[PDB]
Design a binder for this molecule. Structure first.
Ligand code: CLR
Ligand code: CLR
Ligand code: CLR
Ligand code: CLR
Ligand code: CLR
Ligand code: WRU
Lengths: 333, 50, 217, 264
């Protein structure tokens, strides 16, 4: 009944407190800090005429995809700034995009409730809408790929989905979130994935079998971004309460909080470095902050965006960090 | 309804010490710090971005 | 320097840049209207008159291309996608007059209007207000007085004075009177002058923006 | 005593003018939001002001300070011709900005299609064409550089073409903009006050800076009266300081320009 839920929640909190023998900050106290981190805008990708809401790097760490209110995705070659592709969108309201791990496909989604998949390597050359995935009843916040055949998707329906592009229909529906899911993060082995929602909670789900493995709370506002640690055993969540947090899958509770008195603005994007030592959180104070993931000390500041830093990404090889903002420019550091 | 069984399944998971998890996190970070271009600035000769 | 493949890549990038510039120039002349209302405000009738998820209605009037975005099917949180419409030319709000005594979508409409026109994204965005179903209101007021929704109302139970009071209260819900203006119109069950009023409000907003570029506003 | 103060005030004026023009040019070029045809016209006006501040004012200062003028009987003609061209091109930019604003507020719907970079480039090209056509005629015909009012027919042609015609055009095009703004205001106090004050600041500056010089030119060129060198120099530099005033009028009243200045 409704009375036993509180008792079991108290039991879980007591178990978590018992497991909290020490703290991450007090263990990484003696390790040498990285110090000031300096980054310069190596590239400035121009060509968008409206606010940019999402991006995704390619597996080869060279090509990337960017989505803006222009109603057109752009596949950029980050090394030489050349626009490889410009895919017009049927619906101009897009707030998520994803670049397939094999590079063949590119997905996007927004207020049309559809994560449309375009085929980039078609025979005729010109990109075409390979699949239109419908079935969500809310604005589409993030749909990330798994392979050329499967995809996971998060919408404002407070539910996530696992679509088979070839068939075109959901194969698993993840329910349990109270608010709108606004973030996804696939595990490096692609076995589990975490989703942060507007109910100030991030749920770790199992892809293959479906049920919610774990739930992590601690935020005081809506969660706008989330990302696994490169090890795959931890993840960082950015919320509207101006604080990032690092939760651990095995420890089943948060380990460190990244916040400051100067920052009072929500986080729009969170990403990790290749080694996981740096945590790059894009703030809607028109900039980004690089935190020491083991110290919570602000190791650097990335400034140069006139408007809110909507999307942030770190390459697979960790060579560069690309930030896309509402001033319609991408910047590669 | 389904919430009680879902939360029971959540509560019946295995647990680990926070110290061990933090130690593993530090071990991974210090093992892969050498392969992190962002942490240690790579020379511009090997940097594909100029 | 650049090889044949590199030169072809640069040529493709330049052609794509040309296409993007042409598309942006084409789309910068379009007037963006964000249609909002209550559950039974009557926005569907208005859309039918002039012409899944968000519904885009494209129409043309006097060489102006209007795109109207209806987000009535979005039952999610409003603050998580409202900023997407930060750059819309105008917000077409619809209020059903006849729903003033129905148990209380009139109060819900007032609250949602207050939340919309005072939103931080729409500080400088004008609202075109429509008071739909006034023909049914004129006959509903006779049997049911307006005092049910607004106890403070004073005067005769005349549809003209009641409509004036409702309008005045909607412009009283505004707190940015020095920046934005609310254009109020009654549908009157015809489309010609309805689209004419929308066009007039849009032209007024455009002239205001042109005067503000020079600082004269 | 007087000479040092005069030199200091002239040099600070001619350096403030060039810094202001450079600031306007850099603000327009750097900011991606400020890439509009009207901002292109303002940038052209700024570069014309820069030209008249770095090619005309320095030569005027050495004439004023070092009593006489010693740079040859050839470079005097070049300086006078470039001075005509620059100080007429500034006025004609002030006129075409008025044309652009009149078309933008009056025919707002139609002029949006026509507001292309090609239109602004054509406007600036015809401004420079007019400026050249009011500077070249006197070429087909020391120790001092005295203006030669030798041919009366050119005196009326130069003074009407450069100032009085743009004067009437600016007056008409801003009176019409004032009525256009009034029609908007009346159909729905402080807004009318601001609209009157900004137009007054734009018009009265252009009057008080240039009109005395051209009225004395009209007097002298018709052999009516005679004016001393000091008064002529004072009115000449009163005309020059419009190069200083113009960026203040045409950038400080725009929100985008103020934001770009704050960013810089
Ligand atoms: C000092 C030397 C270099 C002379 C400077 C004067 C001329 C050449 C300068 C002054 C203002 C400049 C313009 C300022 C802004 C822009 C818009 C930009 O999108 C392309 C370049 C362009 C169009 C510049 C071209 C060069 C320009 C016209
Ligand atoms: C004769 C010279 C010295 C006059 C002063 C420079 C003129 C030619 C320059 C200054 C600012 C310039 C314009 C600024 C911006 C643009 C928009 C761009 O998309 C095409 C070029 C264009 C239209 C420029 C070329 C012409 C322009 C008006
Ligand atoms: C191409 C331009 C920018 C070069 C510099 C121009 C200006 C700053 C220079 C050129 C010649 C200079 C003048 C040369 C000689 C004198 C006489 C001296 O008793 C006082 C200073 C004064 C009056 C100088 C003032 C500054 C001056 C006017
Ligand atoms: C060299 C001198 C003497 C003459 C130069 C030509 C003058 C008279 C011409 C050149 C361009 C002309 C303008 C071109 C377009 C317009 C717009 C419209 O409102 C009609 C008048 C007006 C404003 C014209 C007025 C006269 C004008 C300014
Ligand atoms: C700075 C503003 C007013 C623009 C005018 C600048 C020049 C032309 C002005 C500024 C200072 C002025 C001088 C100030 C004082 C005197 C002394 C007086 O017995 C004769 C005129 C004379 C010598 C003035 C001549 C004109 C002058 C040199
Ligand atoms: C102050 N300086 C600029 C203003 N002026 C103008 C401008 C337009 C038409 C005629 C004249 C009068 C003249 C005649 C001979 C040389 C130089 C001019 C210049 C002198």
């Amino acid at each position: 009944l409704r009375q036993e839920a509180e008792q079991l929640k108290n039991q879980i909190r007591d178990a978590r407190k018992a497991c909290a023998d020490a703290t991450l900050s007090q263990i990484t106290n003696n390790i040498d800090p990285v110090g000031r981190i300096q980054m310069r805008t190596r590239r400035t990708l121009r060509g968008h005429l409206a606010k940019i809401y999402a991006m995704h790097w390619g597996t080869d760490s060279r090509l990337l995809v960017s989505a803006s209110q222009d109603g057109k995705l752009i596949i950029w070659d980050s090394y030489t700034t050349n626009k490889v592709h410009a895919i017009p969108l049927r619906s101009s309201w897009v707030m998520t995009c994803a670049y397939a791990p094999s590079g063949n496909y590119v997905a996007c989604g927004g207020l049309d409730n559809i994560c449309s998949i375009y085929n980039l390597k078609t025979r005729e050359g010109n990109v075409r809408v390979s699949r239109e995935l419908a079935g969500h009843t809310g604005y589409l916040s993030c749909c990330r790929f798994l392979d050329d055949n499967q995809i996971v998707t998060s919408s404002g329906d407070t539910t996530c989905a696992l679509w088979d592009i070839e068939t075109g229909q959901q194969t698993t529906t993840f329910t349990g979130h109270t608010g709108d899911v606004m973030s996804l993060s696939l595990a490096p082995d692609t076995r589990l994935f975490v989703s942060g929602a507007c109910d100030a909670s991030a749920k770790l789900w199992d892809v293959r079998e479906g049920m919610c493995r774990q739930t992590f709370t601690g935020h005081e506002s809506d969660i706008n971004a989330i990302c696994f640690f490169p090890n795959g055993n931890a993840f960082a969540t950015g919320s509207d309460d101006a604080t990032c947090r690092l939760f651990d899958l095995r420890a089943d509770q948060e380990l460190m909080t990244y916040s400051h008195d100067n920052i009072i603005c929500g986080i729009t994007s969170v990403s990790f470095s290749k080694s996981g030592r740096l945590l790059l959180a894009g703030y809607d104070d028109f900039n980004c902050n690089v935190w020491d993931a083991l110290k919570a000390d602000r190791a650097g500041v990335l400034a140069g965006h006139d408007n809110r830093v909507s999307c942030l990404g770190v390459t697979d090889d960790g060579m560069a960090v690309a930030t896309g903002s509402w001033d319609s420019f991408l910047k590669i550091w | 309804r389904k919430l009680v069984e879902q939360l029971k399944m959540e509560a019946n998971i295995d647990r680990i010490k926070v110290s061990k998890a933090a130690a593993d996190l530090m071990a991974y970070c210090e093992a892969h710090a050498k392969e992190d271009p962002l942490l240690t600035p790579v020379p511009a000769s090997e940097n594909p971005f100029r | 320097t650049l090889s044949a493949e590199d030169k072809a890549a640069v040529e493709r990038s330049k052609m794509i840049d040309r296409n993007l510039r042409e598309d942006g120039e084409k789309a910068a002349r379009e007037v963006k209207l964000l249609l909002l209302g209550a559950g039974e405000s009557g926005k569907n009738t208005i859309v039918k008159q002039m012409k899944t998820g968000i519904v885009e209605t494209h129409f043309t009037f006097k060489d102006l291309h209007f795109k109207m975005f209806d987000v009535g099917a979005q039952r999610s949180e409003r603050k998580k996608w409202i900023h997407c419409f930060e750059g819309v030319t105008a917000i077409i709000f619809c209020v059903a007059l006849s729903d003033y005594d129905l148990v209380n979508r009139m109060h819900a409409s007032m609250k949602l209007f207050d939340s919309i026109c005072n939103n931080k994204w729409f500080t400088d965005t004008s609202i075109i207000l429509f008071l739909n179903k006034k023909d049914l209101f004129e006959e509903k007021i006779k049997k049911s007085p307006l005092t049910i929704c607004y106890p403070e109302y004073a005067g005769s139970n005349t549809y003209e004075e009641a409509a004036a009071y409702i309008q005045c209260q909607f412009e009283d819900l505004n707190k940015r009177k020095d920046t934005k203006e609310i254009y109020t119109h009654f549908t009157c069950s015809t489309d010609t002058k309805n689209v004419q009023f929308v066009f007039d409000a849009v032209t007024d907003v455009i002239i205001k923006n042109n005067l503000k570029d020079c600082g004269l506003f | 005593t007087e000479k040092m103060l005069i030199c200091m005030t002239l040099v600070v004026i001619t350096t403030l003018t060039t810094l202001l023009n450079l600031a306007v040019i850099m603000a327009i070029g750097t900011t991606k939001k400020l890439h509009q045809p009207a901002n292109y016209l303002i940038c052209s006006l700024a570069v014309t002001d820069l030209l008249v501040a770095v090619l005309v004012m320095p030569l005027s200062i050495i004439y004023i300070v070092m009593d006489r003028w010693k740079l040859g009987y050839f470079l005097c003609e070049v300086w006078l011709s470039v001075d005509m061209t620059c100080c007429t091109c500034s006025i004609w930019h002030l006129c075409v900005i008025a044309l652009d604003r009149y078309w933008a507020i009056t025919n707002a719907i139609e002029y949006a299609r026509k507001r292309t970079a090609k239109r602004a480039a054509l406007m600036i090209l015809t401004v420079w064409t007019i400026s050249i056509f009011i500077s070249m005629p006197p070429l087909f015909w020391p120790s001092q550089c005295t203006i030669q009012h030798d041919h009366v027919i050119y005196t009326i042609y130069s003074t009407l073409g450069a100032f009085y015609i743009p004067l009437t055009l600016i007056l008409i095009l801003y009176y019409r903009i004032y009525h256009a703004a009034k029609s908007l205001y009346q159909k729905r106090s402080t807004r009318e006050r601001k609209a009157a004050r900004i137009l007054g600041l734009i018009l009265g500056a252009f009057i008080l800076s240039w009109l005395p010089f051209f009225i004395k030119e009209l007097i002298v060129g018709l052999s009516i009266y005679t004016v001393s060198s000091e008064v002529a120099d004072f009115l000449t530099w009163l005309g020059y300081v419009n190069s200083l005033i113009n960026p203040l009028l045409y950038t400080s009243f725009n929100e985008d320009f103020k934001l770009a200045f704050k960013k810089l």
